[PDB]
Amino acid sequence: NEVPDYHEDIHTYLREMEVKCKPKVGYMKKQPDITNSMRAILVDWLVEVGEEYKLQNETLHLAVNYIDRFLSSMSVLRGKLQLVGTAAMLLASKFEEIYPPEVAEFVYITDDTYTKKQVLRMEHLVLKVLTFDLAAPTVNQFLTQYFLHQQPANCKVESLAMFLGELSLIDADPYLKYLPSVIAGAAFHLALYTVTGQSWPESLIRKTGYTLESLKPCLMDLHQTYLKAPQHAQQSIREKYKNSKYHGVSLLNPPETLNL
Amino acid sequence: MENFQKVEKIGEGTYGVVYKARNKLTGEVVALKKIRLDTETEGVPSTAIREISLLKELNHPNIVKLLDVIHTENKLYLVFEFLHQDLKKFMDASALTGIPLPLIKSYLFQLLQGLAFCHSHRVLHRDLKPQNLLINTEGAIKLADFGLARAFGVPVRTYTHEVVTLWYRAPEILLGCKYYSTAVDIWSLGCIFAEMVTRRALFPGDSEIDQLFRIFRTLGTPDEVVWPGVTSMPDYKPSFPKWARQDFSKVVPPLDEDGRSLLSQMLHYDPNKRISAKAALAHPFFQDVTKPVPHLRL
Ligand SMILES: O=C1N=c2ccc3ncsc3c2=C1CNc1ccc(S(=O)(=O)Nc2ccccn2)cc1
């Protein structure tokens, strides 16, 4: 880390791992009792939990992976979707945070609709279903790798790309069909364009093999998501990124066209 | 869990007790990591979640293998490949006679390979120390105990309350740096490397400050020139004594040039210029490396 040596290896590896630790593109369809919308409401709620407990954005991206992964093979009734979500968050925390919140805290933030006993059992069930493979590559990770390729670093472009990638977590509707390395590529260029009129850098095209053209589809989707962002049913993420910690980038007016 | 027969306790633990067990059906000897679980009322531990998860991704001849994970009601057992003893015990037996340089080289070599594998798979060990390194009678040494291990897909924030061992802790962590880096692991091997050579612990500090001062006293007190940013770091102080760097031929006399060379690059102050596992493996110090067998007492 913080040394150019393994950066290339690590990238190549996360690329392999994202294919393996990826969910079922169309699992929501085969899920009898839950819908994208219920999910979007769930992820948004997790976003708030993250803020409330000052958790990392990685901890949020992971939990989302755990959830999608779980739902890709387990039928869940809406009445339990939150218990699943809570445990997933609990796990992501134990894995990524320096010191996760106590179980009691996760039972609390759910308005005691669930027992501490339930949380702990759902945790085991998730661990069993996920077969302990929790170290999943996130969009947040790929941005990190791409950020080294800036010239120089623009802490506003980053906060924006983070904002866009964090927005994708919400709508499974169009996003489950893109690999994190792709969503990240989209989020990066789109941010780079808005803030500095610059595009997907040649260094990255070579490092990722992705051409601006190849990111076009996801890009179109993300740009479109960026545009309607203010009128979305879920707003927790936008409220999060107008803060001065992220340079209120959620307030930057998106381009109207991308000229692609 | 019924097909296993416990033989003896081979290691205490705050994370869990380790037993040498035997598979009653296959004959395979294994090491069982038993986890409290029933207690804590906080579900599955983090060290367990991280050790299992990260280790399942690391398949290398120099990293102890995780064979299985048996989780149930109140008991969670980690099944690991077993090895005769750790390096701490070995260094002790070797006190009088000492470890031959060809074996020290062999061991360093393999360690750097196992570690290089961890790092290129975005895993930081963070707790490299003699008792966490295992060896067998055929000349193999392996990284073990990935409890404090961390995946660094994104930089790993440093604990406020120090967890890692003290004697092998890198100076960055002592000076209060924000993130860890693969560098902290190389520093540890660097310390282990000297210890094998001198038969003595390189920086045996009593406290965090005593630890920092022993490092300076030997490698000289760092400055802005040697390590840009030092003076600015959180726990750095201007009142720190200004010691001078000592000649490595007085720190580790039994080592040749390539030896003193590698060791100095492994104990390089600024963690951006400290040699990487990957790079060390290509150091001339290893041009004649072999795989000697050690002489181990039961
Ligand atoms: O063989 C092992 N496989 C392991 C996998 C994971 C792990 N995590 C922590 S320790 C450990 C593993 C071991 C331990 N092996 C080992 C074998 C013998 C010795 S020793 O003979 O040097 N010391 C002993 C022996 C008996 C009682 C106390 N200490 C030390 C470690």
The domain spanning residue B59 has which CATH number?
3.30.200.20
Which experiment gave this structure? X-ray
Top CATH class of A9-22+136-260 equals: mainly alpha
Q: Which residues of B touch A140 (CB under 8 A)?
A: 154
Is any ligand 1 atom within 6 A of the Cβ of residue B133?
Answer: no
Contact B48, B42 (CB under 8 A): no
Asked whether B83 lines ligand 1 (CB < 6 A), one says yes
Taking residue B283's Cβ as centre, other Cβ atoms within 10 Å add up to 18
Task: List the resolution, Å.
Answer: 2.8
Are residues B250 and B231 both part of a single domain?
Answer: yes
Q: What is the DSSP letter of A229?
A: G
**A165: contact with B, CB 8 A cutoff:** no
Shared domain check, B149 and B56: no
| B14 and B126 together in one domain | no
Beta bridge partners, B76, equal B35, B71
User: Is A23-135 the same fold as A9-22+136-260?
Assistant: yes
From the list A10, A56, A103, the residue facing B42 with the nearest CB is A103
- The answer, yes or no, to whether any atom of ligand 1 lies below 6 A from the CB of B144, is yes
Q: Are residues B50 and B103 in the same domain?
A: no
Same domain, B74 and B99: no
Q: Where are the domains of chain A?
A: 9-22+136-260, 23-135
Residues of A in contact with B69 (CB under 8 A): 132
Q: Residue B145's domain spans which residues? A: 85-297
Cα separation values, A175 from A23, A139, A221, A236, Å:
11, 12, 8, 18
Block residue for tokens 């472009």? A157
Instruction: Please tell me whether residues B173 and B234 are part of one structural domain.
Output: yes
* Alpha carbon of A108: minimum distance to chain B alpha carbons (Å): 14
Kindly state whether residues B283 and B162 are assigned to the same domain. Answer: yes
Residues A76, A66 contacting (CB under 8 angstroms) = no
Number of domains composing chain B: 2
Q: Which residues share a beta bridge with B8?
A: B20
Please provide the DSSP assignment of chain B as one string: -TTEEEEEE----SS-EEEEEEETTT--EEEEEEE--SSTTS-S-HHHHHHHHHHTT---TTBPPEEEEEE-SS-EEEEEE--SEEHHHHHHHTTTT---HHHHHHHHHHHHHHHHHHHTTTEE-----GGGEEE-TTS-EEE---SS-EE-SSPPBPPSS--S-STT--HHHHTT-SB--HHHHHHHHHHHHHHHHHSS-SS--SSHHHHHHHHHHHH----TTTSTTGGGSTT--TTS--PPBPPHHHHSTT--HHHHHHHHHHT-SSTTTSPPHHHHTTSGGGTT---PPP----
CATH 3.10.180.10 fits A23-135, yes or no: no
Q: How far apart are CA A132 and CA A66, in angstroms?
A: 10
Tokens (6 digits) for A242: 């107008």
What percent of chain A is helix, strand and coil (3-state, nearest 5)? 65, 0, 35
Together in a domain, B99 and B218: yes
Asked if residue B118 lies in contact with residue B223, where contact means CB atoms within 8 angstroms, the answer is no
CA distance A238 to B110: 49
